[PDB]
Amino acid sequence: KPQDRLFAGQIDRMDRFALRYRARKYSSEQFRMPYSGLRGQRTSLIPHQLNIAHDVGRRHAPRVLLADEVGLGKTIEAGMILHQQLLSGAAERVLIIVPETLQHQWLVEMLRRFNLRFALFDDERYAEAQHDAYNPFDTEQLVICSLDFARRSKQRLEHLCEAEWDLLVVDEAHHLVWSEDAPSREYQAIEQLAEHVPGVLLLTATPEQLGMESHFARLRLLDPNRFHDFAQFVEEQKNYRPVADAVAMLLAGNKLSNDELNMLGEMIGEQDIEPLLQAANSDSEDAQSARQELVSMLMDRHGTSRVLFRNTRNGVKGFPKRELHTIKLPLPTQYQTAIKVSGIMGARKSAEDRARDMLYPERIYQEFEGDNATWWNFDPRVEWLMGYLTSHRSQKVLVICAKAATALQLEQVLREREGIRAAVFHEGMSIIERDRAAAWFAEEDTGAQVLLCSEIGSEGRNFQFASHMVMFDLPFNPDLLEQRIGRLDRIGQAHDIQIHVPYLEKTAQSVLVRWYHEGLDAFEHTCPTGRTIYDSVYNDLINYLASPDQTEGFDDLIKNCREQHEALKAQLEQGRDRLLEIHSNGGEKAQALAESIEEQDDDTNLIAFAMNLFDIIGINQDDRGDNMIVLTPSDHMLVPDFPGLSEDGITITFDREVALAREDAQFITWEHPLIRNGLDLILSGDTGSSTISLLKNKALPVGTLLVELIYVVEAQAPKQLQLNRFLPPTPVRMLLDKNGNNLAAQVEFETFNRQLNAVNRHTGSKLVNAVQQDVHAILQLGEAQIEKSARALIDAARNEADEKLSAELSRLEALRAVNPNIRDDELTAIESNRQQVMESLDQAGWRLDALRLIVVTHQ
Ligand SMILES: [Cl-]
Ligand SMILES: [Cl-]
Ligand SMILES: [Cl-]
Ligand SMILES: [Cl-]
Ligand SMILES: [Cl-]
């Protein structure tokens, strides 16, 4: 109790009493932020992602299937939901099941994007953990593992289902093949998992132009009672199709026949549809408002969109356009001889592999003219690269080639013959090396102009500043082609993408140039036709690669491929479930959500307080200069070791854009662990809770007594109840006088704190005991007043709680009457939470947390 700490002669500093109150004030305001758990993640503020996170992340025991189109943010939405439920206390134990080849990607993603360190569980980890616990999976709160690891023994899968996970995440759930009569031994292991875990997130793809029926096998796992018969689900999807068609006619700018519109009327099962129905269709002045309320009611009756989210690249805006630039170069004679040697020596090998050689002329001239053959002197592609680079020196250029060997040789030549700064970015590099290259390439104007990448890594960091891409060569299959473009074709880029493809005339590359552009239209547009056509055309296309000399018969392959492309394109556009796409991307409300967070992101109090907090704790803050502070410990640190700090130091940034370019730095927000740790460090300890201070004011009597009192109103409830939305620990300042009159409302904290000053150890010590009978008599005066202020907070909180928590229960009740996806558990959870919160609010108390004594002098 802080007064007994001050009575008994413990007098802390006056700048630590200042930080302590600011911390309780700031923490209180942030707990109540509307979009808590949605600001600390190291991502762009993309609406369609944020919509899913907000919708799903706030549910209780969420069970969802994320089927967003590839490249839309399936894994980002997954981590956001995790970040929300973990920060809100809704979840504590999480299990992510990933194919082993993807385990490392998830480990780094969850750590750098969401500040979540998962423990990877392999056989080694599992064995050493069997000794440490009855259930091996009780030793870690957050665990990644593979389904093959999970399925190894039966005794192992039993421990997993008994580990009491709050949430489960399964990546690539489409690899789970399921027959109604014969489920695979893998599908049987997951269904057993999804039955022992309340919340379940399923990430999947719906490729090869199939319908939502393929999803039933997984939808069956989320809500087994809603989805219990396959055929009925098929019947439903066929019968829902006309509405989607008619809906698709409306917003496209068509008139809707009355016969058509009495199928939309059947979907929304009401009787007063007609007046609202026609204004949206007659195109009167307010047809805009009649369409938007019309569509909204339609979505609430959709059979799956509440439990299935599928954003397409057509239902989402923001992606940059992609423009192509092709350059036809003379095939140098040194290669012509080099390939004919492979021709003769290529006696016994399939056209499949014969064509694999013809792809890269550079790397067969290194087998017949000896390794390291100086191919960088006659190859026109190199000449074009230099010329292009030296002419656009102020542009960041991503240069992608097939193999790392060619990339390393290119770096050396661009450096040693044109003074071009170029970092190599291949997969063999470690994580620190790639960060080093990404940093150099991200330097605004003094760093690497070029990033020479081997066949690109799979969906790593964002080069939002780069808008130019060069294809030094082209891969065989069209999936890697779209993957290369993927590192740039993302929401949040600076400008549109310019693709430059310098290709040697009359070679396998020249073939792939025409096939990709004329046939599949794969460079400038994103329609996923490539793979289907690639399979239907393989053996023909191969021969034109293994021998680009035989040119006749080719030009018809191209128009045949483009015919397939347009046909495949057409079939997909007519399969769009535009209702599901609008519900997935969140619509207009979601873009509004994205901008509120974009505005909270300029919090300067956060940076000022962080500097203030870090400095008190004793953390040296060297400002390197480019919006990045380097934090290092000191001899004057206040604690043995701080959770996040290491002696080698850490880089931090408060700017969301710098963070996206420098993933090696910590993105500092109110939700970042550094702040939450330092906050707890102060407010858990009791330093800064009791001090004395002198005031120099000519306009007051000597020896007058002001007592600054920081009470704290608190509720005692498990964090699972989320009381912090309505009543977190909230400070109540009071500046009492000798008669118990409160002045705090008139005397703001900062200005008052400015004009105050401390004492020396001795004089202050008994200066307190000079009025120990007085200050003690001052406290009970406020004791009767704090209870008035305390009950004021409680009552307002109970109003704010009962208001919002009943509004949510009403909405869920409205949906259950109109939608089949609302579970019994959901409505029960809200009801149980409303009662428990109002109960925990009726039991809130107050306490004296901090106390600063004031004595006026005129000396
Ligand atoms: Cl201060
Ligand atoms: Cl695998
Ligand atoms: Cl899997
Ligand atoms: Cl397209
Ligand atoms: Cl708790």
Side-chain angles (χ1 to χ4, degrees), residues 256-319:
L256 291 197
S257 93
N258 303 96
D259 182 80
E260 289 169 41
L261 289 174
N262 201 74
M263 255 165 291
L264 175 151
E266 298 154 356
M267 163 150 268
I268 170 178
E270 295 266 35
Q271 274 157 348
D272 50 314
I273 306 162
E274 302 298 315
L276 176 57
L277 192 160
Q278 314 283 134
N281 174 45
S282 299
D283 255 307
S284 66
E285 99 282 357
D286 65 294
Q288 186 65 48
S289 188
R291 278 190 297 273
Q292 293 179 310
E293 179 77 309
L294 166 56
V295 59
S296 306
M297 269 296 181
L298 280 136
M299 314 234 274
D300 296 7
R301 292 109 208 287
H302 210 331
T304 44
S305 73
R306 168 117 193 302
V307 71
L308 195 151
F309 292 85
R310 173 154 186 79
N311 303 69
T312 65
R313 286 187 56 107
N314 298 317
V316 177
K317 273 223 65 60
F319 289 93

Side-chain angles (χ1 to χ4, degrees), residues 126-253:
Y126 176 76
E128 55 180 50
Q130 282 173 312
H131 279 65
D132 297 4
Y134 175 30
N135 190 326
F137 300 101
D138 285 349
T139 70
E140 293 294 338
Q141 302 293 302
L142 316 177
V143 169
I144 297 183
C145 68
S146 174
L147 187 52
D148 284 2
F149 167 90
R151 249 171 57 256
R152 217 76 69 78
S153 77
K154 148 62 39 192
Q155 203 179 247
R156 190 179 292 183
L157 191 58
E158 189 165 312
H159 294 150
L160 250 188
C161 300
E162 301 287 89
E164 307 167 70
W165 306 107
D166 298 316
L167 290 184
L168 169 71
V169 183
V170 188
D171 192 3
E172 306 197 312
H174 50 269
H175 294 342
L176 305 157
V177 300
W178 162 89
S179 168
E180 181 183 337
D181 268 313
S184 57
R185 48 164 186 159
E186 259 186 0
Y187 185 96
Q188 291 184 315
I190 294 291
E191 96 182 335
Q192 194 184 269
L193 274 157
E195 287 166 359
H196 291 67
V197 177
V200 175
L201 298 188
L202 258 42
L203 294 80
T204 190
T206 133
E208 76 174 293
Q209 88 235 33
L210 218 56
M212 314 300 165
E213 52 270 7
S214 58
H215 290 321
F216 174 92
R218 296 123 227 167
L219 296 165
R220 205 192 79 90
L221 296 184
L222 307 173
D223 197 355
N225 289 86
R226 153 77 166 95
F227 311 94
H228 57 268
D229 173 284
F230 199 107
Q232 285 191 35
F233 194 80
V234 194
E235 176 75 9
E236 163 184 322
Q237 297 304 321
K238 283 177 293 200
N239 296 330
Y240 161 74
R241 188 71 232 181
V243 178
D245 277 294
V247 168
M249 303 295 279
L250 163 59
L251 311 94

Side-chain angles (χ1 to χ4, degrees), residues 626-684:
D626 216 359
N627 277 14
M628 309 188 96
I629 294 92
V630 164
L631 306 178
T632 72
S634 59
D635 51 328
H636 67 269
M637 189 66 89
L638 292 189
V639 152
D641 309 304
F642 197 84
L645 281 198
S646 76
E647 169 66 313
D648 296 332
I650 58 177
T651 319
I652 65 161
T653 174
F654 298 79
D655 183 64
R656 179 179 292 273
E657 208 197 84
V658 175
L660 296 167
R662 288 287 298 271
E663 299 208 338
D664 59 302
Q666 304 300 326
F667 176 39
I668 299 305
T669 60
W670 289 106
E671 316 185 358
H672 188 278
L674 274 194
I675 275 62
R676 289 188 285 149
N677 286 327
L679 267 165
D680 173 81
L681 178 57
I682 309 294
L683 309 185
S684 308

Side-chain angles (χ1 to χ4, degrees), residues 92 717-720:
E92 290 173 299
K719 184 179 278 286
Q720 200 270 3

Side-chain angles (χ1 to χ4, degrees), residues 57 79 134 137 154 184 187 193 265 281 305 345 375 384 389 415 478 489 540 622 722 841:
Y134 175 30
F137 300 101
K154 148 62 39 192
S184 57
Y187 185 96
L193 274 157
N281 174 45
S305 73
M345 295 307 307
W375 64 268
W384 185 91
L389 294 178
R415 150 171 50 93
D489 176 60
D540 312 338
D622 191 313
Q722 309 183 20
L841 276 170

Side-chain angles (χ1 to χ4, degrees), residues 496-514:
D496 297 331
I497 309 304
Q498 304 292 322
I499 302 175
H500 298 75
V501 188
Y503 67 102
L504 296 169
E505 164 182 67
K506 304 311 122 175
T507 186
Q509 292 300 319
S510 115
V511 173
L512 288 176
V513 176
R514 299 187 65 198

